[PDB]
């Protein structure tokens, strides 16, 4: 029992420590409401991992973005969707705000099965103005064909985009503090699946040769499928974070981010999220950076 205290104790500095690190890093005075998802990762006592993220447009950085993935062994899925709900409430309930919850209620709606969840997350990208702050969830499901279509007819729609519905298995979800909610699914394609010869048909032949350098350093590559029609967002699952430099042409300010995180305790890999048309230029302007650290018993 006294291990388990003093674990416990320890566990929830280290979190709170990642995030400080983090937000001393890149903003001199942390955005409100971030004291309330401080709050939140620290009344998760079972396993997780956090991710701290930087989305870059030029020499603007935007860097209070914070997720907490739930890891815990037993995997309790609907408890933790209502942990993460009853954190949005608070939120909505300290800023004077109502969230828009259409999206994620016609998407659980009809019976929802959580033993076909496999990731779930929740988190925050927090601005100045109000009106573009958000709240951040993920739903990754396995083998449940009725939930991807109704994702499907929940965002864009028809052909294209649906070229590549057989190859979903995340949904996302924004909920914007002015009452505007979005959802995105991402296509996916995992290593042991790059060279294979039906996957160059159905996905790398429809993508600049660019696109397909960085998966060298990659062990997954996601794309975002229902925003812009030309210019998707790639992302890319680099298992070193050192690899970053070698395969994307950063800015001035994605290479502060990249040196602060060089030498950081936190975990190897990295994801990079960059629109396909950057990938063309000379220098990327636009970026997103997501670093991670694990926090187990
Ligand atoms: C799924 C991956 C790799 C990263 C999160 S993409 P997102 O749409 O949830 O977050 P942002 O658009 O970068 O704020
Ligand atoms: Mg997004």
Not at 278 to 283: P, W
Request: aromatic content about 14%; hydrophobic content about 40%.
């Amino acid at each position: 029992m006294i291990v388990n205290v003093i674990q416990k104790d320890r566990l929830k500095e280290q979190k709170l420590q990642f995030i400080r690190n983090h937000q001393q890093a890149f903003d001199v005075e942390p955005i409100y409401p971030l004291p309330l998802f401080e709050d939140f990762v620290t009344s998760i006592e079972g396993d997780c991992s956090l991710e701290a993220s930087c989305k870059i447009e030029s020499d603007k950085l935007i860097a209070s973005r914070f997720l907490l993935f739930f890891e815990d062994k037993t995997q309790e899925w609907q408890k933790y969707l209502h942990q993460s709900l009853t954190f949005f409430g608070l939120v909505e309930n300290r800023v004077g705000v109502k969230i828009n919850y259409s999206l994620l209620q016609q998407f659980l709606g009809s019976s929802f099965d959580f033993s076909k969840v496999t990731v779930l997350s929740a988190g925050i990208d927090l601005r100045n103005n109000l009106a573009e702050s958000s709240l951040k969830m993920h739903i990754r499901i396995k083998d449940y064909p009725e939930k991807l279509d109704k994702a499907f007819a929940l965002s864009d729609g028809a052909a294209d985009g649906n070229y590549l519905k057989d190859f979903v298995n995340l949904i996302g979800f924004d909920f914007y503090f002015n009452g505007k909610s979005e959802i995105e699914i991402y296509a996916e394609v995992q290593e042991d699946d790059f060279f294979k010869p039906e996957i160059n048909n159905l996905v790398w032949q429809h993508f600049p040769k660019t696109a397909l350098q960085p998966l060298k350093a990659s062990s997954l590559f996601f794309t975002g499928l229902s925003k812009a029609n030309n210019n998707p967002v790639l992302y890319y699952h680099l298992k070193n974070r050192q690899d970053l430099t070698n395969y994307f042409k950063l800015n001035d300010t994605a290479q502060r981010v990249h040196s602060f995180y060089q030498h950081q305790d936190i975990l190897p890999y990295m994801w990079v999220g960059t629109a396909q048309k950057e990938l063309e230029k000379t220098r990327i302007e636009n970026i997103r950076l997501y670093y991670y650290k694990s926090f187990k018993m």
